[PDB]
Amino acid sequence: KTVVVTTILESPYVMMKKNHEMLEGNERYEGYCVDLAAEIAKHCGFKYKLTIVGDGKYGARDADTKIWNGMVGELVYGKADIAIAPLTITLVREEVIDFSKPFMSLGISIMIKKVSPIESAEDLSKQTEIAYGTLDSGSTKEFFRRSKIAVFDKMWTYMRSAEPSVFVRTTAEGVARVRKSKGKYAYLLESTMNEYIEQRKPCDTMKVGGNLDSKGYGIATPKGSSLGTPVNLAVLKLSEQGVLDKLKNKWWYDKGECGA
Amino acid sequence: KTVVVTTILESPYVMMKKNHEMLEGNERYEGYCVDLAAEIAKHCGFKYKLTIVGDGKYGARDADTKIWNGMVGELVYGKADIAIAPLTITLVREEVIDFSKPFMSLGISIMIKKPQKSKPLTVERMVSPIESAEDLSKQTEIAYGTLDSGSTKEFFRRSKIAVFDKMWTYMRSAEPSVFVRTTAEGVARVRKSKGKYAYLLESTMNEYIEQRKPCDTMKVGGNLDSKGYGIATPKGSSLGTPVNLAVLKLSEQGVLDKLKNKWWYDKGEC
Amino acid sequence: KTVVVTTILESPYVMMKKNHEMLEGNERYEGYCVDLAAEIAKHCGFKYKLTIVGDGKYGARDADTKIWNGMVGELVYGKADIAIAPLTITLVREEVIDFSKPFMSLGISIMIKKPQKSKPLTVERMVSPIESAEDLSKQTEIAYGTLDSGSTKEFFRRSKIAVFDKMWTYMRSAEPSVFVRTTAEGVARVRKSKGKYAYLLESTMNEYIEQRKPCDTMKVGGNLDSKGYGIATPKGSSLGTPVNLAVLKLSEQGVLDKLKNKWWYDKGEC
Amino acid sequence: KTVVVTTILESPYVMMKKNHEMLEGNERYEGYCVDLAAEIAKHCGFKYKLTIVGDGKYGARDADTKIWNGMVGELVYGKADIAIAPLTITLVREEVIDFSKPFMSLGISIMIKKVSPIESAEDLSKQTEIAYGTLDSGSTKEFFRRSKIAVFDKMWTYMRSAEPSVFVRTTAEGVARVRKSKGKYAYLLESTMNEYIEQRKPCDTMKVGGNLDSKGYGIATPKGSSLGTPVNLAVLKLSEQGVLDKLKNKWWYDKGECGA
Numbered sequence A, D: 001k002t003v004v005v006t007t008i009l010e011s012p013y014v015m016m017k018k019n020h021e022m023l024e025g026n027e028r029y030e031g032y033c034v035d036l037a038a039e040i041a042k043h044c045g046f047k048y049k050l051t052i053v054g055d056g057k058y059g060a061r062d063a064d065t066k067i068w069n070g071m072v073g074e075l076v077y078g079k080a081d082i083a084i085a086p087l088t089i090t091l092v093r094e095e096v097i098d099f100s101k102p103f104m105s106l107g108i109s110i111m112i113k114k115v116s117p118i119e120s121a122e123d124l125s126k127q128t129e130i131a132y133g134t135l136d137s138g139s140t141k142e143f144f145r146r147s148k149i150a151v152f153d154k155m156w157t158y159m160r161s162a163e164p165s166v167f168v169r170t171t172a173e174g175v176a177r178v179r180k181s182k183g184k185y186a187y188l189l190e191s192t193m194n195e196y197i198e199q200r201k202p203c204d205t206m207k208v209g210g211n212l213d214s215k216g217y218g219i220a221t222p223k224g225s226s227l228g229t230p231v232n233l234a235v236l237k238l239s240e241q242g243v244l245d246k247l248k249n250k251w252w253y254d255k256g257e258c259g260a
Numbered sequence B, C: 001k002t003v004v005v006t007t008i009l010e011s012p013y014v015m016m017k018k019n020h021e022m023l024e025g026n027e028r029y030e031g032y033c034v035d036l037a038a039e040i041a042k043h044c045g046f047k048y049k050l051t052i053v054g055d056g057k058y059g060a061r062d063a064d065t066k067i068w069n070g071m072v073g074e075l076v077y078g079k080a081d082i083a084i085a086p087l088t089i090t091l092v093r094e095e096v097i098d099f100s101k102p103f104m105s106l107g108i109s110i111m112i113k114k115p116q117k118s119k120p121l122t123v124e125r126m127v128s129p130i131e132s133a134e135d136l137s138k139q140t141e142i143a144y145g146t147l148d149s150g151s152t153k154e155f156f157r158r159s160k161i162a163v164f165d166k167m168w169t170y171m172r173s174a175e176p177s178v179f180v181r182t183t184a185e186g187v188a189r190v191r192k193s194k195g196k197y198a199y200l201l202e203s204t205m206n207e208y209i210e211q212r213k214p215c216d217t218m219k220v221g222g223n224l225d226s227k228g229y230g231i232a233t234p235k236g237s238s239l240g241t242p243v244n245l246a247v248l249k250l251s252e253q254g255v256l257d258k259l260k261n262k263w264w265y266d267k268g269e270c
């Protein structure tokens, strides 16, 4: 029996191969999530088929509709069996889907173009000269929306009352907006994506401040499924054996094309 | 019915209070873990009484008997209901007991005695003999050791990376014993061992000791791996889901961050 | 029964919101006074609707007709129940209407246009033409004025200190009118008047304007006196005691300084 | 009819002159509060008799007794008619006596022995090497006891669990303890007292940090007294005419016995 693996097109997690138009099947994708999925399948023993989620959204609940979109929606409704992707572990997701022990740690970073008049998030919040945005239907936007600290609440109040819309459709759009806004635009993305972007050509962006909090990426599976404990133990073995560290090193610092 | 919360005596998670000769109950102890238990009960209401393991061991397995001891040992054989203490999430433990999502992240580090200020324009710089685990593995002068019945001892026992394999091979036949029965014994052996002993321990404890008087020890290199701390619970329990959801609630609410900042860096001196 | 609250259009006390056209009710306005009224209602429960006085005057007793105008003017004749706005506690006002304890301290300052940086080793210095109120009184080049129907105009009218008496005597015979009908008119006269005009106004407004774009204005000297802002109430209304106790609660709970820090220094452009 | 005025032996508010053994009545006292009382009596038109409060207490409620002591207790129980003294306006006091509009602004300050390594209050809260205390039965200790902010609650928790007792009976004892503890002891006193102390021989103490809050000193009368509105209007007139400014200048800087 096949196993549908709903993923996202995120780099270096899943990529299009350099000659992917001559390849059909699982061979046409490469990345950290593909290698992770291969090791999960090898440890468990199931034949898997990588599929891309239909809408490039990780997943959230709509405004007064109670419908899950994206990969989480792909999982709740049974169209998907497992989600090996940069899926952030949260409360709202845990109430409807079950994660694994996180396989990669991360936080909320800040990305700007290359004196550093921003400093940490406090000085970022004090000044309205510089603009900043997040990814719609993500964990960072919902982190700010539900935040009860003063600084984060003021940040969220700014973000919702911004014209034109400051939220970006994809992280590629957000990075392009950081690059093309001559230092006026800032990005609140997950620190792992920030590092990968800051290590690649043309390498004109850099990360300031520490991460605002700390989270993890989990491997999702429908509630009550029989794939929960096996993938949990798979993640634990992969972390204890250094495989997860090795894959992050291969896909994050092995190439490392910039001067530093 | 009340539940028993098993906990180790380790700073700054749980330290016996100064005037604890006459306080009784949950008020005898203080630290990070007691605040975590307070917030856990605040999320979901339950009566809890703190307990400390008799052997004071974190948890591992006996050999040729296959017995769990320590905190995990008490949790396996029913004598505990929940272990709110810095218990590391591992493969062997996850099989027999359940874990919440980690409430704090960590990593194995190396502790050495802080070096002197090298005088030779008129600038003082830090000069250390160890900068990673590779050079600590190759050299045979500066000894090193771990905490008995911990997660790091098992980590080195079953690892396949060559440098960690050599480190374990050295540790297994070190006379006198390089292992320490407690965290404080290891740190004191570092302090008294005249810079001839390097201690392998979690980065949270290492940072905490580094930022407190007399602050003559420092953490070197980087973390050899990444792990976490969760609230354990025996297999087949009704507390697993409420505990995990409480962990997520506390993480998004930022209470864990405040607790760490106020028990690790806000009270630190020197 | 709901109470009506009289308030002036002043910054950062009550400013119409950016999208105030589509918003209606207490959501139209924002600033220090709005959330001060919010916390006042939270402490002692009542329903309130905000208003802005049609004359836009702070309140001063006219001659001949002996009629109060402005905020105090409408508060004398029962057109409001509580005035949450920067109303200055004076002698003439207190004998007619009641005040709470001051919720914010202030004092008369001088606003001048910020001079250009003096070129003269390679350091830039600031040389200002005014350093106190004495030199402002002596010279006859740099003109000065105040806000009509305010506490400052009365303060200079009623004072007996020799230097303040001279300042008032000069102000009364000033062609053209050195008096301004609003705070913004005075500050614009300062910014346009190319350093020939010095504005006398409260230090709270002066600091707030100094910290915003284009910050071409400077506050010189120290405070000429010391006064405060209280929540006014008509003489006889039972609201006076709850209002006073609410002021004390908010001050000791450290929220008045919080609102001041958030609306004055936190959003500091310059 | 005579008017009993309950004051407190505080400098420069009330002093015992220098040769008081040959003087009687109001003529054996000198200070800012004495001059203020003279101005009040002149404005209202009443003969007054200055009386030192029996115990050097400003006023508070006992622990689980609900009895007022000091000047506030002197007024509540009808033994006193008016209290011209450095009496801080608070919530608990306002519920039992009437305060006029404040006549002298002030706040909570820190004095230390003679750039400080602490300065602001957060640093003073972090470092436990250096001790600090307040005046018992005051408003500063009351301010810390009921404070709901994090830093001030931490300060109060430290202060109550201090051995030996860090609280002082008199501000004279507190200043002597700041001077005699070789820079190891800090003090939390009102800014006005701190300035008067720092402007006097031997000028060995200095004030650091900003004001923790801002308060005022009021003129107390018993609840429902006929002397409330007249003394209120007297304070307002005195402030509007510059008399309070002049008296503070006379008793705080006119002498100015220090090198600065």
Ligand SMILES: NS(=O)(=O)c1cc2c(cc1Cl)N[C@H]([C@H]1C[C@H]3C=C[C@@H]1C3)NS2(=O)=O
Pocket: A101, A102, A103, A104, A105, A106, A215, A216, A217, A236, A239, A244, A245, A246, A248, B089, B090, B102, B105, B226, B227, B228, B229
């Ligand atoms: N260095 S890293 O970001 O690639 C990374 C991050 C993590 C790893 C392993 C690696 Cl290599 N394992 C942990 C897991 C291991 C056990 C303890 C926490 C979870 C369960 N999650 S993690 O702390 O998010």
Ligand SMILES: NS(=O)(=O)c1cc2c(cc1Cl)N[C@H]([C@H]1C[C@H]3C=C[C@@H]1C3)NS2(=O)=O
Pocket: A088, A089, A090, A102, A105, A213, A214, A215, A216, A217, B101, B102, B103, B104, B105, B228, B229, B248, B251, B254, B256, B257, B260
């Ligand atoms: N800064 S810290 O060590 O107190 C800390 C550590 C961690 C936090 C949150 C904080 Cl504040 N969240 C994660 C949890 C939150 C959700 C995502 C990963 C797990 C489930 N565990 S963690 O990565 O171990």
Ligand SMILES: NS(=O)(=O)c1cc2c(cc1Cl)N[C@H]([C@H]1C[C@H]3C=C[C@@H]1C3)NS2(=O)=O
Pocket: C101, C102, C103, C104, C105, C106, C228, C229, C248, C251, C256, C257, C258, C260, D088, D089, D090, D102, D105, D214, D215, D216, D217
């Ligand atoms: N920092 S500020 O100007 O917003 C400010 C100003 C003042 C505050 C409190 C604050 Cl936060 N409290 C006092 C009040 C408190 C008690 C003592 C004097 C009055 C009654 N009024 S005040 O001296 O005018």
Ligand SMILES: NS(=O)(=O)c1cc2c(cc1Cl)N[C@H]([C@H]1C[C@H]3C=C[C@@H]1C3)NS2(=O)=O
Pocket: C089, C090, C102, C105, C226, C227, C228, C229, D101, D102, D103, D104, D105, D106, D215, D216, D217, D236, D239, D244, D245, D246, D248
């Ligand atoms: N400069 S000072 O401390 O001597 C000082 C302090 C103050 C003064 C007058 C002086 Cl001189 N008057 C005010 C009062 C006057 C009117 C406005 C606020 C109260 C009622 N109280 S105050 O703001 O606490």
Ligand SMILES: N[C@@H](CCC(=O)O)C(=O)O
Pocket: A058, A086, A087, A088, A135, A137, A138, A139, A140, A141, A171, A188, A189, A190
């Ligand atoms: N991958 C994240 C969202 C991406 C982002 O926050 O930038 C998630 O699963 O929630």
Ligand SMILES: N[C@@H](CCC(=O)O)C(=O)O
Pocket: B058, B059, B086, B087, B088, B089, B147, B149, B150, B151, B152, B153, B200, B201, B202
């Ligand atoms: N925290 C570890 C113990 C520390 C160590 O072994 O270094 C555990 O859960 O076992």
Ligand SMILES: N[C@@H](CCC(=O)O)C(=O)O
Pocket: C058, C059, C086, C087, C088, C147, C149, C150, C151, C152, C153, C200, C201, C202
């Ligand atoms: N607060 C002052 C207004 C400021 C001014 O008039 O200068 C008043 O009540 O009149």
Ligand SMILES: N[C@@H](CCC(=O)O)C(=O)O
Pocket: D058, D086, D087, D088, D135, D137, D138, D139, D140, D141, D171, D188, D189, D190, D193
């Ligand atoms: N004078 C203050 C107390 C003295 C002090 O706090 O230093 C009061 O009346 O509350």
